[PDB]
Amino acid sequence: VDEANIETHGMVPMNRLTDDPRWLPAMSERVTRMVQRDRNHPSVIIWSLGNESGHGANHDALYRWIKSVDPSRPVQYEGGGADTTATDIICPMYARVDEDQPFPAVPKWSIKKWLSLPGETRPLILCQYAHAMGNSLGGFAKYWQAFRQYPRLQGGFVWDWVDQSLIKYDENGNPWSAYGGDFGDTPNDRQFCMNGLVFADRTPH
Amino acid sequence: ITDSLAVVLQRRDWENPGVTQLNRLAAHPPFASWRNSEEARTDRPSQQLRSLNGEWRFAWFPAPEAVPESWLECDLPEADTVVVPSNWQMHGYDAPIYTNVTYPITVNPPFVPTENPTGCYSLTFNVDESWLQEGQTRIIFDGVNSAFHLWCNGRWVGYGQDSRLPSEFDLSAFLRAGENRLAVMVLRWSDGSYLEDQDMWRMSGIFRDVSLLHKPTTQISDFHVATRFNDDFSRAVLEAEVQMCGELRDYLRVTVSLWQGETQVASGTAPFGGEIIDERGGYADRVTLRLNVENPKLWSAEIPNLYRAVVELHTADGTLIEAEACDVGFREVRIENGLLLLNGKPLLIRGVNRHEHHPLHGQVMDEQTMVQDILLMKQNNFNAVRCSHYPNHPLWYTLCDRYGLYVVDEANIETHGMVPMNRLTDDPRWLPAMSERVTRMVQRDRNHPSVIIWSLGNESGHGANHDALYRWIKSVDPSRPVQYEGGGADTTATDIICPMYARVDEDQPFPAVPKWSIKKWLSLPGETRPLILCQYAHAMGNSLGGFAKYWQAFRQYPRLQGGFVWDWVDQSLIKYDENGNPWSAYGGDFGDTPNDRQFCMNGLVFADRTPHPALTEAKHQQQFFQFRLSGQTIEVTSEYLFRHSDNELLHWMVALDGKPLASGEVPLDVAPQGKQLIELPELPQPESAGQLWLTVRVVQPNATAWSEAGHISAWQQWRLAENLSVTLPAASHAIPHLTTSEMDFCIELGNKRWQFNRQSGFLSQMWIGDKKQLLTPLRDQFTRAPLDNDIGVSEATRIDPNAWVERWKAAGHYQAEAALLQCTADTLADAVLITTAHAWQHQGKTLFISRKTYRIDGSGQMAITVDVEVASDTPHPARIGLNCQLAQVAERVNWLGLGPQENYPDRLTAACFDRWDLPLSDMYTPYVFPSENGLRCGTRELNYGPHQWRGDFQFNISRYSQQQLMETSHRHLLHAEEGTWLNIDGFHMGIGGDDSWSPSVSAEFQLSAGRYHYQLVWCQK
Amino acid sequence: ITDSLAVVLQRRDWENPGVTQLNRLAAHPPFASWRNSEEARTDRPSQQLRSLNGEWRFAWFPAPEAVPESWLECDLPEADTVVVPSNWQMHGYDAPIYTNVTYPITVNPPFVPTENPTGCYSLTFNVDESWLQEGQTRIIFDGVNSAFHLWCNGRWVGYGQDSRLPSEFDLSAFLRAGENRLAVMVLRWSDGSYLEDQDMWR
Ligand SMILES: Cc1cc(C=O)c(OCc2ccc(O[C@@H]3O[C@H](CO)[C@H](O)[C@H](O)[C@H]3O)cc2)c(-c2nc3ccccc3s2)c1
Ligand SMILES: Cc1cc(C=O)c(OCc2ccc(O[C@@H]3O[C@H](CO)[C@H](O)[C@H](O)[C@H]3O)cc2)c(-c2nc3ccccc3s2)c1
Ligand SMILES: [Mg+2]
Ligand SMILES: [Mg+2]
Ligand SMILES: [Mg+2]
Ligand SMILES: [Mg+2]
Ligand code: NA
Ligand code: NA
Ligand code: NA
Ligand code: NA
Ligand code: NA
């Protein structure tokens, strides 16, 4: 999945820049210039309009731009409820197998319920599931049971591969794995950079 | 030093489609920042919105680098004082350029000639202390062609592109109390010129209003008004989204009220805070107010009911901060089951394309001309207008809102001259420049109910940027369909099949971009969309042939919902001769090269808004009352969708060969889409010879906002009965005498003599007493002075062999010499009979043969019979008749046949059979490019001076020979010849006009029969 | 004079989402410009695509306006030798920031802090006259975070944004035979950073 370098997660709402036409130029260069560079690679099967930036009208514009200039690949985008007009795939992040999380505007339905909502035609492939932060991947079996039972459940992408720990050296030059704040960075989100199936040195969890 | 021309010009922002603006403020609907809401509710002047129109200082330069540094600090001594808004071409500072498709600059995007005419505008003006103590002072340039840098008090403010949308900059940090100086440097050419290749005059300058706007630092920054409905339009919700800028505080509130006249209809109030829209929450700086409206008065072009929405920004204790306002039209535009609906009813678009053009002021628009245009449109049964091909002056949308016209609002993008047309619109590097021309159009005009359809531009092929911006509009504003003709008129970037110059029945199967028959187009597999031509019926010169063929098809096919004629006004400009008499100029008349000559004049009206003959043909075919007659019962059908005929009578005349017999009036009471049957009183039934004709007009007894009392809105004619003449003519007391020379047959009867030349075989002269009657003999004519539609794009330099004029010229039509075959005289009991036969040849090929009999009888009446052969393999001739130059010049022309206006075989539906009496001046049509003109068809009797001709013919009569018209390129160089040129045709070819670059006269109107016959009688009175 | 930092930094092109590049060439799939068809078929190295990876000269500054004009004409004595490619936080010049959702800078688009860490990268390198007698020579920056201005031999070339796609500029009219010097001013923050809020180390 080749993803454009667009994330506006910290805007309030997440929509603020991606729905503004004054940001459509900046956003189009990050989508279009990706397609122009990577369009010949067979490994790329799906284009992504970015991550966690709500759902703005610029998303719908650039979705249709990709469709027009490269019909050979589906386009996906999770923002604004995972099933917007700018996605060919229902690509939720952390939608649970049986339990609904009915957040206002942007609900995370049961992946099994989500398929059968009236008028919903598309496959579902979680762009992110099974958050692997420390001692986790509890209930991972429950996804794959559901994946195998339901044809339109075609799997997902685990979040994620590598702990984003950095090496620091103490006063005597011993290396140790550091996370949020360990460099005087404030504010910070501490451990939440470490979500990997493997440690930073690629040792398996 | 960073404000110096040296630094600002060195970045060359006008040769870089990545920089379309610098420091420009966001677009939005029209603001006035009223500080009293009753002012806002009544749309009275705002003392927070000053105009800077008036006398500015201007200085021209060949290139921006030639502008001295001194001009930022101080006024240039050799500058002139000049009115703004203006186009600097209209003041004479360089030439306007007329080019159609070929760019007026070398195609080398994004670069521009080093020779780039630059307009240096300066203004010294006062600003109150009040505007600088509190709030935000901005300047608004409504239109700058084509790009500009802006200085204020020597400091640099910003840069702007797109010539037809307003550019706004914040001036608060730049202005001082008292005297200030603006410095505006305007470039004729910029990278934006590559998306501004409309077929029009290429001018430049500050050609729309300049204004200062004062707002409080806490302000309404944007507002959007929508109208939802239930199934039967009995309940509506008005949704009003309001966004603000400045410091949000908990005490801030918004009230939006809805008025209809001085009645408050609804009102709501809320603090700021929108719905949750995603995981980060909602817009703290926005609020949406929903008002209920029961039984709303709906907006349409038939009845433009308006409400007014007032948006007050205030505190909770009531203190008003500012108010904005707009007109509201309750209407729904949807496409449903293949039909474009307005309020649940399928529109039938009686459209026209209208440029912003004035023969004196150029591309500067004024209220008087806009209103004159809207009145003339609505008076000729026009429904809708296409803003070809850019956003208009803001006042235009307000006038269509109130007078009632459907508007296609079209983005300022045309790349016609690129090869292929696709080149820039498919290139992602031009997506930004294109997005700002589309998005800023929608942000400004999305509250006008007159706007029912958004257009992505004109003639720019089909690129992936078109698809991107199509989806942008759908996402941002579902209220309105999006249309675009480029790349074959049915691309993925259009909700409407919007072909230009698709014909009714015949396909034009061009590779990649075919124009199918509009009827066939609808039926193509998978195609579900309505079809509304974005341009049809090219009205260049003597044109709109076959107009009736379109409207029959529009009415028969549901999914054919009409089209927009090209176009409304001749883009003529005024020049002054050596004496200072004005004349209408076109392409090349300003030294502009290369140029596209007459192609700028495509209008139903002249530049001064005098109608062409084609306008009534439009008015007749577009009429809202259709008629049928069975017996003496009239079926009236209303094509109005929303109104009853509560301002309409039906006047009816019955006349025998012009003589009126019976009249009457009947009230009209037809429901929309309804019928009314009317039984006429026992009509006159005379045994008298002649054709009995019934004529009905529809008459509006009451004045409207757009029409005077007694305005005629529709008409129709029927032939009721005919009584063939069977009475023998009255006998004569005398026999006409034949005198035979070797050289002439001369015929005498009373005071009258007829001379026939036996070498030429033509009627050489005719005498009444001593007074001779002819200056040129009476000879056959098989040619006409070529119409724009006959010439097409053919020129002396690059001939097009397939144009009609060229096929004629190549076949020798225009240089063919008559060769006398037979010339005999006989004496009968009661008359003399001259029989003739000529062959017209060219380089050995016989093109035409004409066999005549002239029969002069005791009553002084000359009966001429003509029988023509036309070679099957020569091009079908322009006409088949005779012509002569008469000695007489009378002041009036009197005829029984179709009139009163100019009419041709494929453009005579609006004409009515009656006796017409006009001045000879009105028998000539002053087309700016002279051609064949002023024909009237289906005429049985023509009267001029002592002469009468009877028969069944088409004629024109003028002081201008077909030869002079053919050889003269402007109407102002025509001179009255001695006497009067008379063309009488048995048959005359259609004028065409489906387009004007290819043959467009349809087969049924071509003279292909091979043998023709017609009969005249020439008479004295 | 219009290549000076005073003029180029004046425009503050990193605080304006209407300017994401100046003089940048079009994007395209990966090019190598092989002049032998068998080399292209076997994906072997191309003599027309050289790496500039290696030992560059680098100096850190609290804000772009703190960079001395000297630096375009001449290497800074205070500078250090550092390997490229690299992140300057990994060399200890300032802290990497780990924030998930909340932006690491005050949310005030399109503006960024006045105190905007800037990295001044220079490299002196040779160009064979072969390259300048014919054809086009361009520089490829496969990744620069967050935005940068590029000088070659003291003259200004262009500007670029988007930290994860290549920025290419034509250098043919800037290069001379033998010794050349690139001057790359990289800003940590720019209007582009508003679109780069991925939950990772900044
Ligand atoms: C290069 C090119 C473009 C187009 C266009 O696509 C085109 O066909 C339609 C056309 C449209 C607009 C136009 O010029 C004006 O433009 C104005 C402003 O837009 C109005 O819209 C009017 O339409 C109009 O007066 C002129 C021709 C033709 C053709 N040439 C020929 C010549 C001979 C035989 C077949 C063809 S086919 C070529
Ligand atoms: C504003 C907002 C956004 C989202 C997001 O949509 C969100 O819930 C999902 C979420 C996604 C990514 C994330 O951080 C990481 O970021 C990585 C790189 O970008 C990957 O995306 C990974 O997904 C991820 O580990 C953290 C949380 C919540 C919620 N907050 C709370 C708090 C308490 C109770 C319920 C909720 S619901 C709010
Ligand atoms: Mg520019
Ligand atoms: Mg055109
Ligand atoms: Mg920028
Ligand atoms: Mg995130
Ligand atoms: Na499955
Ligand atoms: Na994380
Ligand atoms: Na119809
Ligand atoms: Na034209
Ligand atoms: Na009536």
Swiss-Prot record, chain B:
Changing residue 795 to D/Q: Small increase of the catalytic efficiency, when the sodium concentration increases. It catalyses: Hydrolysis of terminal non-reducing beta-D-galactose residues in beta-D-galactosides. InterPro entries: B-gal_small/dom_5, Bact_Beta-galactosidase, Beta-gal/glucu_dom_sf, Gal_mutarotase_sf_dom, Galactose-bd-like_sf, GH-type_carb-bd, Glyco_hydro_2, Glyco_hydro_2_AS. It holds the Pfam family Glyco_hydro_2. The record marks 997 as: Important for ensuring that an appropriate proportion of lactose is converted to allolactose. Its cofactor is Mg(2+); Mn(2+); Na(+). Substrate binds at residues 100, 199, 459, 535-538, 602, 997. Binds 2 magnesium ions per monomer. Can also use manganese. Its EC number is 3.2.1.23. This is Beta-galactosidase. It comes from Escherichia coli (strain K12).
